[PDB]
């Protein structure tokens, strides 16, 4: 790239925990992502419960598509691997491609509320590294928005939010028939997590968030402590706005068996009460890790999971 720009990127990420990277993908790569995800999406039937659970059972998710791991690591490296070098440099970390998600919003919807990636990076240790590349597949303009807002970690160091979220999950799991409807129990529980409403976030952050326009080819890179949300899409430009998101960890990132257990139990409890049948795309990263854990782990590191170890070269820089 420019070199001068690359240094500004590194600089900005070091200050904020994020950076918008303009023109990182070529239009041809975008079109390939669009078509491929469009095909993958037509094939499977997906529900709102796994994104709801991921953000703690709060049920304020207003998104159209919430699909995890529709495509595999190989399709992803095929356009991401050549970029890992720039990201490794920006973060001073060695990145491995892991899991992905597709989100979309229709006009006049809130999409996802303010969050940090405690749901996305649930099966990994809080203090270990995690970051995301958010690739919008429909243009984000000043006039129609529909993109994201995001807050410098200088303003909102999101690492503390993980404990708060774990305390809340722990409460979820203490639910009882006596309690009444599970979802209402979770949403009204007097947990610290529930106290942190949008007004509170607003008062905390003020105007310190940033919202940027994106042309196809641009992406947003951010670590898992960055507080962020979807912005509503105004009608008249896109019927729907999609974004494809790649989750990356560090070579040394470790599994967190304890949170993984909390999520499973909560998921289990929710499916049992609501009589639902959670579907996971074959080769979903979460499923793969749960099995390795259920068998018992030899190593703490994600890299030493058998499927990962075998496919490691494709997951990392050349």
Residues belonging to the binding site are 115, 134, 228, 230, 241, 247
Query: Between 257 and 304, whose beta carbon lies closer to a copy of itself?
Result: 257
For the CA atoms of 268, 192, 258, 97, the dihedral, rounded to the nearest 10 degrees, stands at 90
- The residue range among 10-18, 104-112, 159-167, 178-186 that interacts with a copy of itself, by the rule CB under 8 A, is 159-167
Residue 270 CB, nearest distance to ligand AKG (Å)? 21
Q: How far apart are CA 119 and CA 213, in angstroms?
A: 26
Alpha carbons within 13 A on the beta-carbon side of 214: 31
Binding-site member from 160, 291, 298, 306 for a copy of itself (CB under 8 A): 160
Give yes or no for residue 91 binding ligand AKG (CB under 6 A). Answer: no
Query: Between 81 and 120, whose beta carbon lies closer to Cl ion?
Result: 120
Binding-site member from 78, 204, 229, 311 for a copy of itself (CB under 8 A): 204
- The residue range among 64-72, 105-113, 260-268, 308-316 that interacts with ligand AKG, by the rule CB under 6 A, is 105-113
Binding-site member from 200, 276, 299, 306 for a copy of itself (CB under 8 A): 200
Query: Between 56 and 175, whose beta carbon lies closer to Cl ion?
Result: 56
Longest alpha-carbon distance in the chain: 62
Write the CB contacts of 59 (distance below 8 Å, at least 6 apart in sequence): 52, 183, 187
First to last CA, the chain: 17
- H-only helix segments in the chain: 4-16, 27-43, 49-54, 73-80, 84-91, 159-172, 182-188, 192-195, 198-205, 257-274, 285-295, 306-310, 312-315
- The residue range among 66-74, 161-169, 259-267, 279-287 that interacts with a copy of itself, by the rule CB under 8 A, is 161-169
**Secondary-structure breakdown of the chain: helix, strand, coil percentages, each rounded to the nearest 5:** 40, 20, 40
Q: How far apart are CA 271 and CA 124, in angstroms?
A: 23
- Interacting residue ranges for Cl ion, rule: CB under 5 A: 117, 120
Contacting residues toward ligand AKG, per CB under 6 A: 103, 105, 111-112, 120, 132, 134, 148, 228, 230, 243, 245
Which residues of the shown chain bind a copy of itself in the complex (CB under 8 A)? 156-157, 159-164, 167, 171, 189-192, 195-196, 199-200, 203-204
């Amino acid at each position: 790239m420019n070199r001068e720009q690359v240094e500004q990127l590194k600089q900005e990420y070091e200050e904020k925990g994020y950076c918008q990277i303009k023109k990182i993908f070529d239009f041809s790569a975008i079109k390939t992502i669009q078509k491929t995800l469009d095909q993958a999406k037509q094939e499977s039937q997906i529900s709102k419960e796994k994104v709801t659970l991921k953000l703690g059972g709060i049920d304020d998710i207003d998104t159209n598509d919430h699909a995890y791991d529709l495509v595999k690591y190989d399709f992803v490296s095929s356009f991401i691997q050549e970029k890992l070098a720039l990201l490794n440099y920006i973060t001073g970390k060695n990145l491995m491609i892991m899991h992905n998600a597709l989100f979309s919003v229709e006009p006049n919807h809130k999409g996802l509320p303010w969050h940090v990636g405690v749901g996305s990076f649930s099966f990994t240790k809080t203090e270990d590294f995690g970051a995301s590349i958010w690739i919008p597949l429909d243009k984000i303009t000043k006039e129609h928005r529909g993109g994201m807002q995001y807050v410098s970690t200088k303003i909102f160091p999101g690492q503390f939010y993980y404990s708060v979220f774990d305390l809340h999950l722990k409460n979820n799991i203490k639910w009882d028939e006596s309690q009444g409807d599970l979802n209402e129990y979770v949403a009204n529980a007097n947990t610290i997590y529930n106290k942190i409403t949008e007004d509170v976030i607003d008062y905390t952050i003020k105007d310190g968030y940033e919202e940027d326009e994106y042309n196809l080819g641009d992406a947003f890179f951010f670590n898992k402590y960055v507080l962020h949300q979807s912005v509503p899409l105004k009608p008249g430009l896109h019927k729907l706005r999609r974004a494809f998101v790649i989750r990356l960890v560090d070579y040394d990132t470790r599994v967190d068996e304890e949170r993984l257990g909390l999520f499973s139990k909560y998921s289990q409890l929710h499916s049992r009460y609501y009589k639902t049948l959670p579907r996971y795309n074959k080769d979903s990263v979460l499923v793969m890790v749960s099995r390795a854990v259920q068998k018992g782990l030899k190593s703490p590191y994600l890299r030493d999971i058998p499927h990962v170890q075998q496919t490691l070269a494709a997951r990392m820089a050349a």
